[PDB]
Design a protein around this nucleic acid. Structure first.
Ligand code: ANP
Ligand code: ANP
Ligand code: MG
Ligand code: MG
Lengths: 239, 251
RNA sequence: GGCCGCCGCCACCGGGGUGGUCCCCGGGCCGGACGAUCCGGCGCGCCCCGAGUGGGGCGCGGGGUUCAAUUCCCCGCGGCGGCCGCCA
RNA sequence: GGCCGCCGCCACCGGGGUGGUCCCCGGGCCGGACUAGAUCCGGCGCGCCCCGAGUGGGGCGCGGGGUUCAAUUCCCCGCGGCGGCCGC
């Protein structure tokens, strides 16, 4: 069967590169897989503007959503907030597909390094900040626990990852009358105990009086709430 | 004014993507919200190509353009080899009553092969030659397919001029749904007088076997009569038609 | 490219009407008498008279019905919508 | 990361309800009835104590404290399990 693979990690950690390589190995193992991320649409605009984010976010989600109907989808996005990963998981749940969160990690050193090597189009200060605010996968919710944690400073074994993911895709993602009688007879008993201030010994009789009464009732086939309750009220009035 | 759909068309390696980015940049400096979209966005998200992904690719790409045109100028960076493809892109713009301009980019087979080689010949040169050979320039069969601009991408391109021309055109009223404006009509009484005076004129022409000359006077006699009547406020159909019959009788 | 539905082929543009040589409503422009207003008009082609660069005549894809076709009928070309085919 | 919360601590398991000494629902298992069946009847955990020392019977308790005539329920603390919204 097929699944939703959710990457998470800071800008420059290697999400996009890891995505392409993962997809390529999967393709060799005979799987139809597509790589999606908010960046596809975000970079389609010639400049950045806060006001495009809504459309960017909505459109990326529609593509992911429509793609998971027929293909494995690798979501290549920073996904720094747990609520963002929750949102992606809701798509998998909706289609009853399995999902795996893959957390790519790297020291802040490497991150700043790589960011400089890219023209620091994202200011290093913002990178530092994001590293601090990042939501550690699984620290808050079991559903957020990373299927794998990848160290992008060391070599990566895609065949092994593929193998594990393929196995995971084969798992099963699972994700009147009577009570009325009990409820109400309980109310009546409390009403009665109040109106007569019975003693410790006489209340116990009333309790037992109700147990015996209820037990007898669950024996008869035809039972009408209102009529049974009336029978109970008068049983107490003459006891 | 408002926003429009810019449709690019031209063979692989002609420079569509490069032209797209530059045009999008200039438009942006000119205060326009524009996005660049093409089937490649989705096609290259797959690690391999398979003909069965194409339906999805097409469905996905059109949905994006469609939803984006509600809010932004859309530049479509796709080969758009066939007119029916450009037609489908126009129907999106008609769906939202937005202007559109087909921009046709060309270059000699000479440059296309060279550039195709410099790209590792992912597309066999043979295919490039053939595509180039069978390609029908836009506008050769349909008027709605006539390019707004034809750009030689081997020559210098002036993006400010183009941007300028594009902005002007966005400020025009599309000839899409000006075909449903069923109004500016006269009240039933007026139209009833037009219709009836027309039949009376015909009845009269018959009863007196007029010649081409004498008929023209009757026609002008009707024109002058209706003109005068639409100047009065209170008009009774039956009364007016009698006045017209008599006007003809003492002619 | 094929099938079906519908519309255009009256001529500044849009819409509408119509067996009257077109007409109506809104928009545009030109001319004229008087500058608003009012009155006349508007494309293309062929011919003719004129001699000055104007006036007039015939025509508007083909054919039919008819005194008369923009209108009705058959065919041709084109538009729009629907459905199929095409789509390195 | 912030704010908040749900579930269990009634006792085969899971879900639900409930100030009445617990109950309802689904599943499971044990014993009996049953010319493999199904249905019907009875029942189910841990701890300490007692008669018997019989694969038997009875008693009391169910993390601690509080409100109570009565707590599975409600408040507070404890242990174990899990989530929501928002941070965009
Ligand atoms: N596994 C790796 N080891 C070392 N360098 C890497 C590795 N993966 C990627 N890089 C380099 O790190 C830089 C950024 O890689 P990239 O995959 O674009 O990160 P990203 O997380 O997708 N970035 P962003 O899209 O901005 O969040 C480039 O120089 C990559 O070549
Ligand atoms: N105006 C230009 N002058 C010189 N080279 C150009 C020009 N435009 C594009 N190129 C180059 O031609 C090659 C392809 O350009 P590109 O804009 O990607 O063409 P394309 O039509 O988008 N190709 P494709 O996506 O395969 O249909 C690259 O080397 C471009 O830099
Ligand atoms: Mg990336
Ligand atoms: Mg391109």
């Amino acid at each position: 069967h097929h699944m939703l693979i959710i990457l998470t990690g800071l800008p420059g950690v290697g999400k996009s590169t890891f995505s392409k390589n993962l997809a390529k190995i999967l393709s060799k193992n005979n799987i139809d897989v597509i790589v999606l991320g908010s960046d596809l649409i975000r970079e389609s605009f010639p400049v950045w503007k806060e006001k495009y984010e809504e459309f960017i976010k909505k459109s990326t989600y529609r593509l992911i959503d429509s793609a998971l109907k027929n293909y494995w989808v690798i979501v290549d996005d920073t996904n720094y907030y747990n609520s963002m990963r929750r949102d992606l998981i809701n798509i998998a749940k909706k289609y009853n597909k399995n999902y795996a969160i893959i957390y790519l990690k790297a020291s802040l050193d490497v991150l700043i390094r790589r960011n400089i090597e890219r023209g620091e189009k994202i200011p290093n200060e913002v990178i530092k900040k994001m590293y601090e605010k990042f939501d550690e996968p699984g620290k808050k919710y079991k559903w957020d626990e990373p299927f794998l944690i990848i160290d992008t400073t060391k070599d990566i074994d895609f065949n092994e990852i593929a193998k594990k993911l393929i196995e995971k895709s084969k798992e099963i993602p699972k994700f009147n009358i009577s009570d009325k009688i009990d409820k109400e007879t309980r109310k009546i008993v409390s009403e009665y105990i109040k109106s007569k201030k019975l003693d410790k010994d006489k209340i116990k009789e009333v309790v037992e009086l109700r147990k015996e009464f209820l037990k007898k009732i669950k024996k008869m086939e035809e039972v009408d709430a209102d009529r049974v309750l009336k029978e109970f009220k008068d049983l107490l009035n003459s006891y």
